[PDB]
Amino acid sequence: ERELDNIPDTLPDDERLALWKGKLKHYLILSSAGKPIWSRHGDLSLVNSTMGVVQTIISFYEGARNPLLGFTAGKVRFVILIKGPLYFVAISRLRESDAQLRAQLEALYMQILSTLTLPILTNIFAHRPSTDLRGPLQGTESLLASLADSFTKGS
Amino acid sequence: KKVLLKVIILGDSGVGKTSLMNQYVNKKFSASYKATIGADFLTREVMVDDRQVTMQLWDTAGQERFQSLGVAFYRGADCCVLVFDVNNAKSFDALDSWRDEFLIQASPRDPENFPFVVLGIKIKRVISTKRAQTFCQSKGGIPYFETSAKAINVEEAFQVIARNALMQ
Amino acid sequence: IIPAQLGFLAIYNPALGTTDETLEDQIVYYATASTLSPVSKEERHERLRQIGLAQGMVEFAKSFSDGEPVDTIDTEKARVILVEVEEGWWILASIDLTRLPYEYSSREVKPPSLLRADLLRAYDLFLLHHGSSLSSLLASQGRAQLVASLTRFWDHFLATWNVLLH
């Protein structure tokens, strides 16, 4: 019933989909194939059709070489964030700006990042122990220096 | 974690894919968008041995104006279903064009072992069963099933295609 | 540098075409930047795709918005406006953003709420000189005459319509 309550599995499918659609805030993470990765509300059986609709809408604008940033319907805002094969969608009935929603999707992406990268990075170095990461990190040195200087100024 | 499979339903428009999937899929979770953005997005729970599998069904509209978007429709597909009407000869002849266009646009890993299933819809028929199996046998032995919209072999066709996806 | 301009505008009514053979009948007017100055199969497919995508986004968002349609779409290169001017009749307008070397900007462009009010006033202006409503006109004078009447009005309006602030 309440916003942060989990949608019950025992309820009939009509009410569950009704409860899901009524939430004030949704967070959707899906692959570029349309396969669901994570949803704040709802289970795999309930959200996957919505994922396919979202991937298709995003794909029309990818196909047009004109990426989709977001859209508005009444009191609801949709924000799209694309990071390679990962599609992030925020759907909000709260009074949240596009920049606030985009920042929230960016933060969820960083949480996904820490979990996935260290295993695949370890697996890479297991097959190629001599891997030199200076190449793929070129251009980020300037940002690394600035972040280090922010710490040094704090003292 | 529960297994998820992305299943593409291919076939000529008007063959009867929508009415057929209506008997099978969970209508409560269907999303009907064929005329607008080129597909119906359906879902259904399938039991393969003890494991319970959730299927993500993409029932494509098959209209010409959606051909370019086949790259995004088919991306990451686990398996593909080819549908024809046994009374519509043109729908049978198109099965070779749908399969080749699917392999080109989807470009899946292990193309020679990618799971396929051919479905012939029944309602005096033009396409004989043996002529359909010869095409299925010609394409690496695709499992062939015949059914009516009034269920039948649809449940068995998807348990077969789900089982072959899990082997990969 | 290419200034922001009107990409395309469409007037459609889904009730005028409920089968796939009659989908293009939904469209009573369609103008692109090129047309403002013979439709190929590719162009016809593209128009049906633009209008179908708008309807699909409307259908999708209605599940989350208590039935409210999509009214604004923000893309990297275009600002898209969608307005239901009367029950069943829709105006879809895509404004290309300013191209600078490219990089795309919307600083010079009118806000979505302003573009919508421009299209509604043009709608009000068209009716003021022709009839009570698009639905009433369709029954009174028929499709051919209504489309011809809409083409004369909207071609002239879109040629002069300024999507920039100044």
Numbering used by the authors:
A (entry chain A): 199 to 353
B (entry chain C): 5 to 127, 133 to 159, 161 to 178
C (entry chain B): 12 to 48, 92 to 155, 183 to 247
Which lines from the publication concern this structure?
MC1 has been identified as the GEF for Rab7/Ypt7 and localizes to LEs1216. The sequential inactivation of Rab5 and activation of Rab7 (Ypt7 in yeast), which then serves as marker for LEs, confers membrane identity and directionality during the endosomal maturation process. Our study shows that MC1 forms a heterotetrameric complex with specific localization domains and a catalytic core that acts through a unique mechanism, thus representing a novel class of RabGEFs. The enzymatic activity of MC1 is mediated entirely by a core complex consisting of the longin domains of Mon1 and Ccz1 plus an extra N-terminal helix of Mon1.
To gain mechanistic insight into MC1 function, we determined the crystal structure of the catalytically active CtMC1core bound to the nucleotide-free CtYpt7–N125I. The structure was refined to 2.5 Å resolution revealing two CtMC1–Ypt7 complexes per asymmetric unit. Mon1 as well as Ccz1 adopt the typical longin domain architecture, with Mon1 harbouring an additional α-helix α0 at the N-terminus (D211 to G220). In the asymmetric unit the C-terminal α-helices α3 of both CtMon1 molecules are swapped such that a dimer of the trimeric CtMC1–Ypt7 complex is formed. The heterodimerization of CtMon1 and CtCcz1 is mainly mediated by the central β-strands of both proteins, which form a continuous β-sheet, and the α-helices α1, which are oriented on top of the β-sheet alongside another in an antiparallel manner. The interface of the MC1 complex with Ypt7 is mainly formed by Mon1 (∼960 Å2) with smaller contributions of Ccz1 (∼450 Å2). An additional interaction interface is formed by the ‘elbow loop' between helices α2 and α3 of Mon1 that interacts with the α3–β5 loop of Ypt7 (∼350 Å2). In the CtMC1–Ypt7 complex, the conformation of the Ypt7 P-loop is identical to the nucleotide-bound form and coordinates a sulfate ion from the crystallization condition at the position that would be occupied by the β-phosphate of GDP or GTP. Interaction with MC1 leads to a dramatic remodelling of the nucleotide-binding pocket of Ypt7. Switch I is moved 18 Å and switch II 8 Å compared with the active conformation observed for ScYpt7 in complex with the GTP analogue GNP (guanosine 5′-[β,γ-imido]triphosphate).
